[PDB]
């Protein structure tokens, strides 16, 4: 996955990555 918020979380569009 990749973090695009870069938050250190897995959340919305990060899970379809
Ligand atoms: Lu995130």
Redesign the pocket.
Known sequence: FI??????????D?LLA
């Open positions: 973090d695009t918020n870069n938050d250190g979380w897995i959340e919305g990060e």
